[model samples]
Target chain A: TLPPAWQPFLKDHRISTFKNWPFLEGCACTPERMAEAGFIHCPTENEPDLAQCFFCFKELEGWEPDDDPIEEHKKHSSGCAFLSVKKQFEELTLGEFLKLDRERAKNKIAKETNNKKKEFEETAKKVRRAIEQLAA
Target chain B: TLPPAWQPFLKDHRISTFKNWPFLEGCACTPERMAEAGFIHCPTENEPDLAQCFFCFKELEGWEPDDDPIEEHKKHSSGCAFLSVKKQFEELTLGEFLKLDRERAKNKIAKETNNKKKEFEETAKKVRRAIEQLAAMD
Candidate 1:
């Protein structure tokens, strides 16, 4: 229960740029494919079709696309703020985008917390034992 | 000499994005500003200007004014990759944006690292103390 509730921690959000960014090698998400698919990644360290659309802020993860950036973008996020290329982020006016955004945040947190939960729990256990000893 | 070399990191940096993201009144970066500034926040709790911008993929922060949002955006980083109103952000091609994006990413790490450096060490210290106690307990 605790784990699932917090499992989104490493689900690969942000999933790019800097340290935990990405580093791919002959994966389904080729550098060109991800880029053409409207996602950018450094060839030096890459991830799979797990690219995200900064415009709509969608993960577009598990893409595995051959070159359908727009199609995939719309398919994944029906109310994408960027579907209308000309539309600015400030103009979406809310709705599904916010819905997706909320879930997106949750997934990222779950991923972060999941990664930390282990260390936290281990430390907690240690601290708990220490307290018990002190109390005793 | 090293100051000049280290200067690039702070060139286009909204340095406050890290330590002072939500600049005022409980994180100064309000919910309205985050959305209007073209971003969203939510990971159990959303971040204000400290949040990430999807298009440019940068953290738009340090807001202490009404139009500070737009001005600071343009002033700090000119290549936004997705500012339709000002015909911006997308104005820069993927290649150009990526170049700028790299530097921006660098800024995030530097800024965030600087901001969190303390928390990280503090946590390590806490964990280390616990570890020592556990060892002695056994």
Candidate 2:
């Protein structure tokens, strides 16, 4: 666990690759699902719920029973291009993959702040319409 | 070029890890050896010669001019019980592995033959010496 197989990759990107999370039963973080989600089950000294996605080398933990493995992988490490995952990328060029990484980073930023923008816009639009109705 | 995602395992395994060795020009053996040995060059639709080990799933290609993947597999596979190769046991339960196979029978037969050959060699040596003394003394 000291040097996980993905250690160098994660380190190269200055990402943390170890943490403790109690492995819950009935968790969808099963090995098969994790593999499909581009993760390998790399547990740390005390954590059994830990895993690192090879594609992005993004380590994650704290899995709930209902947490869909792929969705959470995308939610937390959306910059992971390999999530297109159906590709499996044995065919894609390295250049193609790096492009995906850039795109995913932008996509992640937009998704991260998307909810705030939606909430403010809807609230202001409703308030303006309400004021117009009362004045009319 | 591909994602170096599997980079760690490949480096740890000490394989070329990147070169694509499709069927090459000349060789001691033929592609028959590799096929008989169970290896795959990457498909035309996929990456180049990147065959994974059936046993360890340790993938390596970039074959040398005189390389034999099968013998290398044996050095690792026969010694390695990790061969989930073809899902070693599928519908069959654990007992199936316990059951003896043809290799075990052949090994037993060879051991029996070895014991008989040693016995006969010792008997022949003693008989030759006894006859020599009998002809000279009696």
TM-score of 1: 0.25
Compared with the true structure, what per-residue lDDT tens digits does model 2 show for residues B44-89?
4454555654223445545555777667656645643322223322
Runs with alpha carbons beyond 4 Å of true place in candidate 2: A1-27, A89-136, B1-138
Going through the candidates in order, the fraction of native interface contacts each one reproduces equals 0.00, 0.00
Per-residue lDDT of model 1, residues B1-118, tens digit only:
1133222222133232334334445543444444455453422235343455534545644445454454555666567644444434324333443355465566557667866998
Q: Give lDDT tens digits, candidate 2, residues A1-136.
A: 1124223322222223323334334666554555566665677667667776665656677777677778988888776667664443333334454466566556556655786799999999999999999989
- Every model's TM-score: 0.25, 0.28
Across the candidates, what are chain A's individual TM-scores? 0.33, 0.46
**For each candidate, what's the DockQ?**
0.02, 0.02
- Lowest-sum lDDT 10-residue window in model 1 chain B: B1-10
